[PDB]
Amino acid sequence: QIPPGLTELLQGYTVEVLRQQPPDLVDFAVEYFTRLREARRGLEHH
Amino acid sequence: IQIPPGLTELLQGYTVEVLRQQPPDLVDFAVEYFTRLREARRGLEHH
Amino acid sequence: QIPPGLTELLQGYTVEVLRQQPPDLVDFAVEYFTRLREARRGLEHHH
Amino acid sequence: IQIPPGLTELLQGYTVEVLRQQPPDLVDFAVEYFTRLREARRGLEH
Amino acid sequence: IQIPPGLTELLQGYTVEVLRQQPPDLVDFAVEYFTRLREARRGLEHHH
Amino acid sequence: IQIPPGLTELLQGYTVEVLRQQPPDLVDFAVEYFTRLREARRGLEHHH
Amino acid sequence: IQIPPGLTELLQGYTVEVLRQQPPDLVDFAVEYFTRLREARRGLEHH
Amino acid sequence: QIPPGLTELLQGYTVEVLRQQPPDLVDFAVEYFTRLREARRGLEH
Numbered sequence A: 001q002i003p004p005g006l007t008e009l010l011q012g013y014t015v016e017v018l019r020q021q022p023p024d025l026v027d028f029a030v031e032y033f034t035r036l037r038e039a040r041r042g043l044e045h046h
Numbered sequence B, G: 001i002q003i004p005p006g007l008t009e010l011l012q013g014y015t016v017e018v019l020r021q022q023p024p025d026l027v028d029f030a031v032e033y034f035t036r037l038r039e040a041r042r043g044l045e046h047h
Numbered sequence C: 001q002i003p004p005g006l007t008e009l010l011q012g013y014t015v016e017v018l019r020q021q022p023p024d025l026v027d028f029a030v031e032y033f034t035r036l037r038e039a040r041r042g043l044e045h046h047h
Numbered sequence D: 001i002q003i004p005p006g007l008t009e010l011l012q013g014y015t016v017e018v019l020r021q022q023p024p025d026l027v028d029f030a031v032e033y034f035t036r037l038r039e040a041r042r043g044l045e046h
Numbered sequence E, F: 001i002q003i004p005p006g007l008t009e010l011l012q013g014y015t016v017e018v019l020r021q022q023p024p025d026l027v028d029f030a031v032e033y034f035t036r037l038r039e040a041r042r043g044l045e046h047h048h
Numbered sequence H: 001q002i003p004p005g006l007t008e009l010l011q012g013y014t015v016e017v018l019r020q021q022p023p024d025l026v027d028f029a030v031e032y033f034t035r036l037r038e039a040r041r042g043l044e045h
Helices: A006-020 A025-045 B007-021 B026-046 C006-020 C025-046 D007-021 D026-045 E007-021 E026-047 F007-021 F026-046 G007-021 G026-045 H006-020 H025-044
Strands: none
Touching: A006 A025, A006 B007, A006 B026, A025 B007, A025 B026, A025 C006, B007 B026, B007 C006, B007 C025, B026 C006, C006 C025, C006 D007, C006 D026, C025 D007, C025 D026, D007 D026, D007 E007, D007 E026, D026 E007, E007 E026, E007 F007, E007 F026, E026 F007, E026 F026, F007 F026, F007 G007, F007 G026, F026 G007, G007 G026, G007 H006, G007 H025, G026 H006, G026 H025, H006 H025
């Protein structure tokens, strides 16, 4: 039982790892999901 | 397509803890989990 | 040279040891990696 | 962040064996390895 | 007595491989196993 | 589980020296101790 | 002539330490070595 | 280079292990060498 939205979340991270090719995958995870959270807050405020 | 080295392990480590801890928000937990992970990594490297 | 995915795997186990503070590291390893494999299978079953 | 007594030793023991044995799957090998290790510890305790 | 941190784990690691690999000589295998362990450690520290 | 003959003695000998000498690094000392044990054994087998 | 399991390993451990510590009295050192060895075994058992 | 007297010391312990078949080799070592030391003291008086 995979919770709703988990695979989409991981695919968004993945498509960007593939495009941006950041050297550190762990650093990029922190940076990417921080930006995602901010994008969501912008969407929710709008 | 080539998934880069270590990506699949990273996603699966996050996934096991989503299933174990059942967080109320997946994005918040993503920021939390990977921050603690990066810090765990620093701990190991300074050991 | 270390195989791809090895350090990521160890770091995921390490981050949980630090958070969960298990009484026994070996018991936790068995539990942890067993659940990780189950999470992997779940992911693969989903799609 | 203090690495618990014994942790690095466990990780290094698993790692030296990945390097020796070149398992086809690291997760399967982690399950198998730490299971055997617990069985070894049990024998040493008896 | 006061067993230092990591000793039991070290010995269990060696032990699990003695049981697995059934080496004909335990002493030879000890030198062999701990030398490889040390080199694995160097490898892990270099990766970072 | 079947522990092979001589293993637990091997581990206890390493252990009594860890407790006595308090080496800075367990793995480094394991290499040194078991290398030296091998030499001692070679000595005993040549005196024969 | 069968040597019991563990005997040569015992003797070699005492011998390596004679070579390390150069006791001038072999018998005094044996009493101390095997008394310390028993203590060490007791430590491993209560851990 | 094995120091003088070491091998005959181990052989004396070994002959008694084979004969007495002690249940614990370490205990017997403490016992055997403590007794050997008492015997030596005896001989020196």
